Amino acid sequence: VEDWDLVQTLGEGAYGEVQLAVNRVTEEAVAVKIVDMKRCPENIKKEICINKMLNHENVVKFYGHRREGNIQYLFLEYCSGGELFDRIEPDIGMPEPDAQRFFHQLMAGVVYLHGIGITHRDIKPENLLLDERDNLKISDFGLATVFRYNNRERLLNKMCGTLPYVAPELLKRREFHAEPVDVWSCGIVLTAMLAGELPWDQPSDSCQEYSDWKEKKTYLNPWKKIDSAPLALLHKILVENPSARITIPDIKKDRWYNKPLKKG
Ligand SMILES: NC[C@H](O)CNc1ccc([N+](=O)[O-])c2cccnc12
């Protein structure tokens, strides 16, 4: 209802909703996210601000914004593929080669953000969308923040994200580095892709499955389903001390990351 028609609803969140919009003239589809500033103005000025810095094949495109009352309309690459979340069969996952391709594209997109000083802070399957050729795009920069500016890094302090995807250090430390928190969330995504379940409600000492993982009891029930090469990588990513945790440039040299699996 704004040059374009609002055809169907797409992701009815908390803020408002993402609707799929078609232009009646040119037939061209986009996603419009609708936030009613009445039902925050602050995190949304940061969302559009971050969006405008973004340009990458693995990040959802930002087209633009109008304000039409209280009503902000962010205009965004429609992804006809939906969420990665729906590609994961519960308890089983997906073919190893499909996970590897999606993990590569997740890595490209994270490398890019980090490169420009931006941490997403809430990477999970629900926020990874698939285009027409199944290419992964990181989506929703609503919790995104800047962690490097004029080449100085700032530690984060605010806790945010989604508990099963969060790194331990965000539960435990007053300040922590952004990058390792995104790497961790990437590991839980890999886990989800390869087993079809989440390892733990949260990475606390007070949580059994997490305790079990630090004790390397991988005979148990996310990990058993995985396979020794991708598991090896997961042992490097889901390391509790954020300093000893593998980094991306080192994920790119990992044996499974570089294992040939998948046809064109
Ligand atoms: N973090 C956003 C979460 O993905 C919301 N759920 C969604 C499902 C499907 C589509 N879509 O283009 O089919 C969306 C498209 C744009 C935004 N969200 C979508």
Instruction: Label the pairing between strands 148-149 and 145-146.
Output: unpaired
- 199 C-alpha vs ligand 1 centroid, how far in Å? 24
Q: Is 242 helix (H, G, I), strand (E, B) or coil?
A: coil
- 129 C-alpha vs ligand 1 centroid, how far in Å? 7
Of 89, 116, 146, the last residue of a domain is 89
Q: Which of 3, 36, 91, 122 is catalytic?
A: 122
Domain count, the chain: 2
Burial 190-226 (b: 16+ CB within 10 A, else e): bbbbbbbbbbbeebeeeeebbebbeeeebeeebbeeb
Q: Indicate if 161 and 75 belong to the same structural domain.
A: no
Which residue stretches of the chain are H helix? 42-53, 96-115, 168-172, 178-195, 208-214, 228-237, 248-251
Q: Indicate if 78 and 130 belong to the same structural domain.
A: no
Task: Give CA–CA dist 253/83, Å, rounded.
Answer: 28
Q: Which two tokens stand for residue 61?
A: 């495109």
- 39 C-alpha vs ligand 1 centroid, how far in Å? 20
Q: Indicate if 113 and 198 belong to the same structural domain.
A: yes
CATH no. for residue 78? 3.30.200.20
Q: Indicate if 138 and 230 belong to the same structural domain.
A: yes
Q: Indicate if 231 and 161 belong to the same structural domain.
A: yes
Q: Can you give the residue range of the structural domain that contains 217?
A: 90-264
Q: Indicate if 136 and 250 belong to the same structural domain.
A: yes
Q: Indicate if 179 and 262 belong to the same structural domain.
A: yes
Q: Nearest-CA neighbor of 135 among 162, 108, 117?
A: 108
Of 71, 89, 107, the last residue of a domain is 89
Helices and strands, number each (H, E), in the chain: 7, 12
Atom of ligand 1 nearest to the CA of 85: 4
Hey, whose CA ends up nearest to atom 19 of ligand 1?
11
Q: Indicate if 107 and 56 belong to the same structural domain.
A: no
Q: Indicate if 124 and 71 belong to the same structural domain.
A: no
Q: Indicate if 124 and 214 belong to the same structural domain.
A: yes
Q: Which two tokens stand for residue 147?
A: 């962690």
Please compute, for residue 72, the number of CA atoms within 13 A of its CA located in the half-sphere on the CB side.
22
215 and 223 in contact (C-beta within 8 Å)?
Answer: no
Q: Indicate if 217 and 178 belong to the same structural domain.
A: yes
**Residue keyed to tokens 């996603």:** 31
Q: What is the DSSP string of 166-224?
A: S-HHHHH-SSB-HHHHHHHHHHHHHHHHHHSS-S-SS--TT-HHHHHHHTT-TTSTTGG
Task: Give CA–CA dist 155/114, Å, rounded.
Answer: 14
Q: Is 70 helix (H, G, I), strand (E, B) or coil?
A: coil
169 and 176 in contact (C-beta within 8 Å)?
Answer: yes
Of 62, 89, 116, the last residue of a domain is 89
